[PDB]
Coordinates of C-alpha atoms (C1' of nucleotides) and ligand atoms in Angstrom, one line a residue:
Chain A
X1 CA 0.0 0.0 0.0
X2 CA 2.3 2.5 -1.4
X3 CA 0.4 4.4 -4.1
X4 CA 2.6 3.9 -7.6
X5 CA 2.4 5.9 -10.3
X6 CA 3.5 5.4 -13.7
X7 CA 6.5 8.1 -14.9
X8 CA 7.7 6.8 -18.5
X9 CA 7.1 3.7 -20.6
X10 CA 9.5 3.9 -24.0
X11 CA 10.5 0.9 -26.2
X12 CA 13.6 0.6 -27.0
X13 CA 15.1 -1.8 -29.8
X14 CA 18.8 -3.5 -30.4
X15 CA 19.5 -5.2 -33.9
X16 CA 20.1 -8.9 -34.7
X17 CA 20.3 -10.3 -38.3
X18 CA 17.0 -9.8 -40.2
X19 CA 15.5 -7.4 -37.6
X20 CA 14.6 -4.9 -34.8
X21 CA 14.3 -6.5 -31.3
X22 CA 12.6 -4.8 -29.0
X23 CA 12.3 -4.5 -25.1
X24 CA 10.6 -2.0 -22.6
X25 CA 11.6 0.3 -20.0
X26 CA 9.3 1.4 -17.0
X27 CA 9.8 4.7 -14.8
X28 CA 7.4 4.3 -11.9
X29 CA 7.3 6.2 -8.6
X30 CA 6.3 4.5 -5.1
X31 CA 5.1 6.7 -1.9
X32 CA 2.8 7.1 0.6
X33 CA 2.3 10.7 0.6
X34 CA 4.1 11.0 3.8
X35 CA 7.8 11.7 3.5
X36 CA 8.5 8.5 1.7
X37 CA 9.0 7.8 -2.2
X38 CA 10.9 5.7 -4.7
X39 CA 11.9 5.4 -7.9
X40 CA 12.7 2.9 -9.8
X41 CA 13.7 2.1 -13.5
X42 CA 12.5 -1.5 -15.1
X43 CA 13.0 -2.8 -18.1
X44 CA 11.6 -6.3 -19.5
X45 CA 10.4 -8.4 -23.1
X46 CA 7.0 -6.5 -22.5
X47 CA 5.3 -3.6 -20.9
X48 CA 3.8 -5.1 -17.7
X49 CA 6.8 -7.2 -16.6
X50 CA 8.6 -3.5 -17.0
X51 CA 6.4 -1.6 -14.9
X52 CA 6.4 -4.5 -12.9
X53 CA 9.7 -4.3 -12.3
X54 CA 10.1 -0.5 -11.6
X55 CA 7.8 -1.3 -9.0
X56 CA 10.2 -3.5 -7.6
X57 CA 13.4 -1.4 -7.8
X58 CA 11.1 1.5 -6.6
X59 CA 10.1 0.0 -3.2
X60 CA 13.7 -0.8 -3.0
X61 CA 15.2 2.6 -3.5
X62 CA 13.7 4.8 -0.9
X63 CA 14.3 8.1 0.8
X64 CA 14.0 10.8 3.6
X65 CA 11.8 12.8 2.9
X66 CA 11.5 15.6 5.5
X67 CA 8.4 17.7 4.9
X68 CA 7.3 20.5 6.6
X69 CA 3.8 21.2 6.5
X70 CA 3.6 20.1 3.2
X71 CA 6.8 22.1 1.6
X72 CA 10.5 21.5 1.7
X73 CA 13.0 22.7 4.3
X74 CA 14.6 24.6 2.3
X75 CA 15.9 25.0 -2.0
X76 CA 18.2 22.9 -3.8
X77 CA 19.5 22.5 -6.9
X78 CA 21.0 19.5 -8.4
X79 CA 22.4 18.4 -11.2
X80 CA 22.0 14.8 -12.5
X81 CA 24.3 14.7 -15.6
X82 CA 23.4 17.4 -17.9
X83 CA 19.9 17.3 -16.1
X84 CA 19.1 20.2 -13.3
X85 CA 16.1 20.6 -11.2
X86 CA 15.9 23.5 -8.6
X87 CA 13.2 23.2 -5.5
X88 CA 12.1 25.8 -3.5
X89 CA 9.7 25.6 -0.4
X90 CA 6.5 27.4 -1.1
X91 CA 3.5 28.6 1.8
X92 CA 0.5 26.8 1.5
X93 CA -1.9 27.8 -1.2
X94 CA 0.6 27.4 -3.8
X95 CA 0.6 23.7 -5.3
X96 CA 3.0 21.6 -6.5
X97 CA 4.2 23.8 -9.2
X98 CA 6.2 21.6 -11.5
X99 CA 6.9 19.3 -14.6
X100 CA 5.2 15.2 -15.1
X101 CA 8.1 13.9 -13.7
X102 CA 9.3 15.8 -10.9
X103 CA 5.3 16.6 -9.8
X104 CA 4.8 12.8 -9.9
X105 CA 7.2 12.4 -7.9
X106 CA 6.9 15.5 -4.8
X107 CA 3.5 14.2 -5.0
X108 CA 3.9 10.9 -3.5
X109 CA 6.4 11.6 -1.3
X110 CA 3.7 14.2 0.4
X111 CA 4.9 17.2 -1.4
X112 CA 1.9 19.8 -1.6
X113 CA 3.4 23.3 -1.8
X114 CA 6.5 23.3 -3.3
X115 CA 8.0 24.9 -6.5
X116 CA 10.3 23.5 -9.3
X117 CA 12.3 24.3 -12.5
X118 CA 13.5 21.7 -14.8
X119 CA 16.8 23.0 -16.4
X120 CA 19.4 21.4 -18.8
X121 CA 18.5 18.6 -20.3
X122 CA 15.0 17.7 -19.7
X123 CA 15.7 14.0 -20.5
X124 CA 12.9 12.4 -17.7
X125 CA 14.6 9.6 -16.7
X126 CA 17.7 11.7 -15.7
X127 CA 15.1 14.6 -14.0
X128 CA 14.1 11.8 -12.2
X129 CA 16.5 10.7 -10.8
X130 CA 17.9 13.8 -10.1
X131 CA 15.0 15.4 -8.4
X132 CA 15.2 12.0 -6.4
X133 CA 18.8 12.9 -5.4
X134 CA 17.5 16.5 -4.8
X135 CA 15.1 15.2 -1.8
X136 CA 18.0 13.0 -0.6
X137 CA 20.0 16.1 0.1
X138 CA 17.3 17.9 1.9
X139 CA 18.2 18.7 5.3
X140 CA 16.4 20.1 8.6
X141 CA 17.1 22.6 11.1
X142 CA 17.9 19.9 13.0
X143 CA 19.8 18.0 10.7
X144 CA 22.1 20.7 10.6
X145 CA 22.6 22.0 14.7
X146 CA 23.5 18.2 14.8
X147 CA 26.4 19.0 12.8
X148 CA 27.7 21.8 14.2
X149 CA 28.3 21.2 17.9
X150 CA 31.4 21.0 20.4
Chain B
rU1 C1' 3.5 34.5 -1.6
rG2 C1' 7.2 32.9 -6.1
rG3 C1' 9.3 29.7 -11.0
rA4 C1' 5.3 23.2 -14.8
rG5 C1' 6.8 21.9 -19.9
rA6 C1' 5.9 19.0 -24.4
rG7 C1' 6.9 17.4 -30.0
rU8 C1' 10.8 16.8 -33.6
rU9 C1' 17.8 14.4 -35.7
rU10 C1' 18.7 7.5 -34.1
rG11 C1' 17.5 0.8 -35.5
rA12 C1' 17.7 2.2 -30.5
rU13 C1' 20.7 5.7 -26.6
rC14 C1' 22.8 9.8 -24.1
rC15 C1' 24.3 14.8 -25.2
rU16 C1' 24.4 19.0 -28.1
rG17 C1' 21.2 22.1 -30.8
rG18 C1' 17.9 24.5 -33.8
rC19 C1' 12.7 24.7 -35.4
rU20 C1' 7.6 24.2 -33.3
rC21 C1' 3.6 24.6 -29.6
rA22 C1' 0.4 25.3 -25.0
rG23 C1' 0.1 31.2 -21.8
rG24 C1' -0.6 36.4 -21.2
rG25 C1' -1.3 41.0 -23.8
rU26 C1' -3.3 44.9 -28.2
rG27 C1' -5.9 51.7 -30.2
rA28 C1' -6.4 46.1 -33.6
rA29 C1' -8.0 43.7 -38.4
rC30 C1' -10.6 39.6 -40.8
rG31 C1' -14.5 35.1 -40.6
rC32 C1' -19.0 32.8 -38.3
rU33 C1' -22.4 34.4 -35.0
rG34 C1' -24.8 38.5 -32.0
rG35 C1' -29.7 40.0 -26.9
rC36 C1' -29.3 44.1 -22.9
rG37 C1' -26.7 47.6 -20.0
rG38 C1' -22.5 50.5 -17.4
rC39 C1' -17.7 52.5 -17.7
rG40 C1' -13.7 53.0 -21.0
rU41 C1' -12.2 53.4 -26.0
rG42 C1' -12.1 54.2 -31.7
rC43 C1' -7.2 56.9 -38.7
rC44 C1' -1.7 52.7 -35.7
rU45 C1' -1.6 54.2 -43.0
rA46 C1' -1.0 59.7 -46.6
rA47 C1' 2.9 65.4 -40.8
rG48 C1' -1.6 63.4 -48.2
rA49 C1' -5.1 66.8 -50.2
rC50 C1' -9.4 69.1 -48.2
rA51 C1' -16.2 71.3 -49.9
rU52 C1' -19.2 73.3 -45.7
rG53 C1' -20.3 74.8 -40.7
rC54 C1' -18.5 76.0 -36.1
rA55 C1' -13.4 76.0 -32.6
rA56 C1' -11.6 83.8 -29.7
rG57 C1' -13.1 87.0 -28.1
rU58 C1' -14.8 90.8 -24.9
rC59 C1' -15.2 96.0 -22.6
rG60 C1' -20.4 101.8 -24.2
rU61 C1' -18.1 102.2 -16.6
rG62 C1' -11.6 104.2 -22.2
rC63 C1' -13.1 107.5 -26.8
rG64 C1' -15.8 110.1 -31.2
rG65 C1' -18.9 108.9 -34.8
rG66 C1' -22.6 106.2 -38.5
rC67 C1' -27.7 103.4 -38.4
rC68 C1' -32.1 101.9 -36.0
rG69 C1' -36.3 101.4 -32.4
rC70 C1' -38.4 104.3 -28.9
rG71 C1' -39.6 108.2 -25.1
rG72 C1' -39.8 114.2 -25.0
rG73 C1' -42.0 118.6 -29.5
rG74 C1' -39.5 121.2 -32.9
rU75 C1' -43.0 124.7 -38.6
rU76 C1' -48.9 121.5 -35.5
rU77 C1' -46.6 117.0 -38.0
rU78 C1' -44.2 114.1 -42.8
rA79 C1' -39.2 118.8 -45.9
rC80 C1' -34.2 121.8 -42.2
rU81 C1' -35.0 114.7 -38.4
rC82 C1' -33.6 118.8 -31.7
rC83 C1' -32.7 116.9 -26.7
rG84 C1' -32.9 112.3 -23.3
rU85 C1' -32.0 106.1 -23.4
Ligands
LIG201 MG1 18.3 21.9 -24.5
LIG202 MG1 22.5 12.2 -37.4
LIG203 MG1 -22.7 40.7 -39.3

RNA sequence: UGGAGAGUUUGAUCCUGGCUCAGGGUGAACGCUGGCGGCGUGCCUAAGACAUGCAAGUCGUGCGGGCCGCGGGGUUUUACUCCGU
């Protein structure tokens, strides 16, 4: 009883003698709306294995998320390759302001007011999972006075 | 209190990178269609050329006259038309 939800389905295709040969490749989010999401990239022969899959490698890839009333402790950018994503808290009232993939993805993890800018390449399988490493550098108050001490 | 991206180069991939689109806006124009009202607003081109009317006057308590309507009788009155407004 996470929720899932379904990021990216492409088919992609390699070459043997006589012909195209083709396999699948899933990009499917996990989270329970409460600080915790995953992602996960699957790739099988056809389309439900895949997502299947992703589901999998989702559950198993996890993360900290520390939410605050619904936004973020504070902004970040990161860069995944030539990918970039930037997050900034936001008040309530404000939505999650952002692209398919990176709103997917705030979503489950119990993001409700946050705000987002794809930059660089907008590929969304490196947005992904940079947005995933994004939330993975998110630290609190806390986090941080527990850092610095004596 | 503030920020969404997507399509397209490959057999398929990543990147680069252009083209393209969704939005808002306007002294608008054009097409189909059109019931009311309020407040705004309407030659963006030929600073081309313009019929016609009107758009800058006012003071008689600055001044002297012409003309007229009266009042008041000059020859009684119209011909010499005298004072007052
Ligand atoms: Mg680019
Ligand atoms: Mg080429
Ligand atoms: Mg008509």
């Amino acid at each position: 009883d996470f929720e899932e939800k379904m990021i990216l389905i492409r088919r992609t295709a390699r070459m043997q003698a006589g012909g195209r040969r083709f396999r699948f490749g899933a990009l499917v989010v996990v989270g329970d709306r409460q600080g915790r999401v995953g992602l996960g990239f699957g790739k099988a022969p056809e389309v439900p294995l895949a997502v299947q899959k992703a589901g999998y490698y989702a559950r198993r890839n996890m993360v900290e998320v520390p939410l605050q009333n619904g936004t973020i402790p504070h902004e970040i950018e990161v860069e995944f390759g030539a990918s970039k994503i930037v997050l900034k808290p936001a008040a309530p009232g404000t939505g999650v302001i952002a692209g398919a993939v990176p709103r997917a993805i705030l979503e489950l993890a119990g993001v409700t007011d946050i705000l987002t800018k794809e930059l660089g390449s907008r590929n969304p399988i490196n947005i992904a999972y940079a947005t995933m490493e994004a939330l993975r550098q998110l630290r609190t108050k806390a986090d941080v006075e527990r850092l610095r001490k004596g």
